[PDB]
Design a protein around this nucleic acid. Structure first.
Ligand SMILES: [Mn+2]
Ligand SMILES: [Mn+2]
Ligand SMILES: [Mn+2]
Length: 430
DNA sequence: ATTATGACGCT
DNA sequence: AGCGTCATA
């Protein structure tokens, strides 16, 4: 009863850009706005690979990972923007720079954790306490939440989508006790008010729309964010969790979309997150290990303690290229040419990073894949990174991998290389 | 022949 | 240190 931790101590948001690389290209090229369109890398092989898709194009069934030639079969009028190519490879600089635009705006409101190129977690607990003090126990008006869904509402004793949103929001706000500054539901609501402001700032200052989730932890905030994309935000309260989880496939929860989630389903003979509540913590630990078991036990009750890490910048800067099928690198000079191309992009990004962020990478990680290997990476070796020079980095990379060559002929390379990856790691202040 | 990333956990 | 997992556009 009185000692059951409820995991309602924090207010956490997750902000995720809608169709992000597409919006970056649509801002640049107004002809692409409000159209079925997609972003593609390369073009020669089946029209290129799609990596982002506008919501107009999704309506035709176009998805990420689709070849553009195939997407065009579903959507003949699909418009395409190509990722820039530099030094023989796709170059993602435009999208990394657009990401920085958004992250810098979010950072004005609170400490953020950069979770991907297009999303960040926000810990809003302190900002909420401050805003609550400003509001002086005044009610929260629906006008302050013009794009917010309250998950699970409306409920109980209109056929339009926006009408339903407002009905649910009205029920929520009608119920709210605004007279205690410690009610978790109130805290989430004020959190949502701040996120409306954040999302308005992002759109005003960049042109980009986004969605967001507001809840008491990172996992629920991420889940919430996806519930009403695009261009909307969703509040998932502690109380909404039992109904939400009762039909929520386990794989939808962050970190359970892969092998672990599959094992939870198979070993326990269940389908939905809520079904986990019927196991003891020790039972879950017995199957999934101490850490995962404890995590699952709390998470299926809506509780998670993983903090929003204060980290706005990526921890690594990496460059990679696949050499699929016939193009696999079979000669030494081929290997060295591509190592140089990768190293040159890496030096460019590293030098920019050093100037912008007052830090230096100290370790170079070199990874390759060999033809036939099921795994994404066949081999990872590290060496010192002492100077930002592409020629040195590419020479050093070759040194740590050259013994992988099984060829008696040193001119030839065996087995052919299907992937090269260079990654600068272990930053230190400079 | 989705590709090009990035973070974290295990041993 | 090197490997594996899970996630992103
Ligand atoms: Mn997104
Ligand atoms: Mn995202
Ligand atoms: Mn996505």
């Amino acid at each position: 009863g009185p000692h059951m931790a409820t995991g309602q101590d924090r207010v956490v948001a997750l902000v995720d850009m809608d169709c992000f690389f597409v919006q970056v290209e649509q801002r640049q090229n107004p002809h692409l706005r409000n159209k079925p369109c997609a972003v593609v890398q390369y073009k020669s092989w089946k029209g290129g690979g799609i990596i982002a898709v506008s919501y107009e194009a999704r309506a035709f069934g176009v998805t990420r990972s689709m070849w553009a030639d195939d997407a065009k079969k579903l959507c003949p009028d699909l418009l395409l923007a190509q990722v820039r190519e530099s030094r023989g490879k796709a170059n993602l600089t435009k999208y990394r720079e657009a990401s920085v635009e958004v992250m810098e705006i979010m950072s004005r409101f609170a400490v953020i954790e950069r979770a991907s190129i297009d999303e960040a977690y926000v810990d809003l607990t302190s900002a909420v306490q401050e805003r609550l003090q400003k509001l002086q126990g005044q009610p929260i008006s629906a006008d302050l939440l013009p794009s917010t869904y309250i998950e699970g509402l409306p409920q109980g004793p209109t056929v339009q989508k926006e009408g339903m949103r407002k009905q649910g929001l009205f029920q929520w706000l009608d119920s709210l006790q605004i007279d205690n500054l410690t009610s978790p539901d109130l805290q989430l609501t004020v959190g949502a008010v701040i996120v409306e402001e954040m999302r308005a700032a992002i759109e005003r200052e960049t042109g980009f729309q986004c969605s967001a989730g507001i809840s008491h932890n990172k996992v629920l905030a991420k889940l919430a964010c996806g519930l009403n994309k695009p261009n909307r935000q969703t509040l998932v309260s502690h109380g909404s969790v039992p109904q939400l989880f009762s039909q929520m496939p386990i794989r939808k929860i962050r970190s359970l979309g892969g092998k672990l989630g599959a094992s939870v389903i198979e070993i326990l003979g269940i389908e939905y997150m809520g079904e986990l509540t019927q196991f003891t913590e020790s039972q879950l630990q017995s199957h999934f290990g101490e850490k995962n078991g404890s995590w699952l036990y709390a998470m299926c009750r809506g509780i998670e303690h993983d903090p929003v890490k204060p980290r706005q910048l990526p921890k690594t800067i990496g460059c990679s290229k696949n050499f699929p099928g016939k193009t696999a690198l079979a000669t030494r000079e081929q290997v060295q040419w591509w190592l140089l191309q990768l190293a040159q992009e890496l030096e460019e990004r590293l030098t920019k990073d050093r100037n912008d962020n007052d830090r230096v990478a100290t370790q170079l990680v070199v990874s390759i894949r060999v033809q036939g290997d099921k795994r994404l990476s066949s081999l990872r070796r590290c060496c010192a990174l002492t100077r930002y020079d592409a020629h040195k980095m590419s020479h050093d990379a070759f040194t740590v991998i050259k013994n992988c060559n099984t060829s008696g002929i040193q001119t030839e390379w065996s087995p052919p290389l299907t992937m090269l990856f260079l990654c600068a790691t272990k930053f230190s202040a400079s």
